[PDB]
Structure 1
Amino acid sequence: NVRLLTEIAFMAALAFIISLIPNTVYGWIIVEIACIPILLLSLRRGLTAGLVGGLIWGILSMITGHAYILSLSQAFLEYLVAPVSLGIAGLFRQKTAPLKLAPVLLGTFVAVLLKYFFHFIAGIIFWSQYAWKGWGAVAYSLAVNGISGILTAIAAFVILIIFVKKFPKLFIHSNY
């Protein structure tokens, strides 16, 4: 389907275009608002669409050199697997009105948690040389990635709650 392919490409391109915005709170702590179009894609079109949009967004980050890349496996883990994992929100898609808020927040929560889980593992393995003085690798990664995860969920929550209320039909795909 052609409408699908193009929804996917548009939301992935929109994620990258959003990932161009300064979002650093402090050091490597970030508010990852660029996740939002992918989560929106996932919730509206289901898992597969989401994984694919996540995959596309990730490649875009890399090929334009906006990804932080220390190595093949690290970039694999953080710019393929991690953005793809947002598609997990697709398991929470609603196909029939009226749209409930609960599966939107439950899906959003779980998908960001999953992405940041992958960043947390990456922090431990590839990013510890950056840990603040006195901090082991695990504590530092939980701090950076736990906090960033939460702020991201928070922003994702604010924006999708607004969307649920003002434009609920964004989340329900129908023909016609």
Structure 2
Amino acid sequence: NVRLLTEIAFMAALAFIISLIPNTVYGWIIVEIACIPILLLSLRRGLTAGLVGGLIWGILSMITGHAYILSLSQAFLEYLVAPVSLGIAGLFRQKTAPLKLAPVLLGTFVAVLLKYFFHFIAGIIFWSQYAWKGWGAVAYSLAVNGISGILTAIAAFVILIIFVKKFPKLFIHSNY
């Protein structure tokens, strides 16, 4: 209630704080560990809570000057649509015990995939001026964003697996 709103705000604040950590692997290839609090929020509280947490994270990135903004339409795609889209993991919420790892991992996979699909589309339209010598716009965006998405999923997998084994109730909301 009040509690749902606090959880959302705190996880979005957490994602933003985490996003301040340097995460560059090479060029524009990143490991986006900042997705994890939004993933966890979504898995615990469902689609709407996740969408809104993603929204708040994106707005925070932009208004603090930490987003890479090339245009209104690009920033809309990459810092509203993209982070919001992590909320899709919410469709994999488990409401009842025992907690299973399967929906956690499938939901993480589908949500990181969806986010980076939007970054991949953005990459084609707005970032092709950076494409490695000899690479076309699509192939360059596929490699940058394909690799970033996989790496981000790897990291999300590692952390959430630990969280499932050690703190499975992070994932299951209860009153009481």
Cα distance in 2, alignment partners of residues 129 and 46 from structure 1:
38
Cα distance in 2, alignment partners of residues 22 and 80 from structure 1:
21
Cα distance in 2, alignment partners of residues 28 and 126 from structure 1:
13
Residue 33 of structure 1: SS of its match in structure 2?
coil
By how many angstroms is 1:26 displaced? 0.4
Cα distance in 1, alignment partners of residues 162 and 70 from structure 2:
37
By how many angstroms is 1:120 displaced? 0.1
Cα distance in 1, alignment partners of residues 34 and 144 from structure 2:
18
User: Is 2:136 aligned against 1:120?
Assistant: no
Cα distance in 2, alignment partners of residues 108 and 37 from structure 1:
11
Aligned to 2:34: 34
By how many angstroms is 1:87 displaced? 0.2
By how many angstroms is 1:123 displaced? 0.1
Cα distance in 2, alignment partners of residues 137 and 96 from structure 1:
45
Aligned to 1:57: 57
Cα distance in 2, alignment partners of residues 110 and 41 from structure 1:
15
By how many angstroms is 1:3 displaced? 0.2
Aligned to 1:9: 9
Within 5 Å, which residues of 2 pair with 1:92-111?
92-111=92-111
Q: Could you list the per-position Cα deviations for residues 118-167 of structure 1 after superposition, in whole angstroms to 9, with x for gaps in the alignment?
A: 00000000000000000000000000000000000000000000000000
Aligned to 1:166: 166
TM-score by length of 1: 1.00
By how many angstroms is 1:41 displaced? 0.1
Cα distance in 1, alignment partners of residues 143 and 95 from structure 2:
37
Point out where structure 1 has 5 or more consecutive residues left out of the alignment: none
Q: Could you list the per-position Cα deviations for residues 31-77 of structure 1 after superposition, in whole angstroms to 9, with x for gaps in the alignment?
A: 00000000000000000000000000000000000000000000000
* Alignment root-mean-square deviation, CA: 0.2
Residue 133 of structure 1: SS of its match in structure 2?
coil
Residue 13 of structure 2: SS of its match in structure 1?
helix
TM-score by length of 2: 1.00
By how many angstroms is 1:174 displaced? 0.5
Q: % of aligned pairs identical?
A: 100
Residue 53 of structure 2: SS of its match in structure 1?
helix
By how many angstroms is 1:23 displaced? 0.2
Aligned length: 176
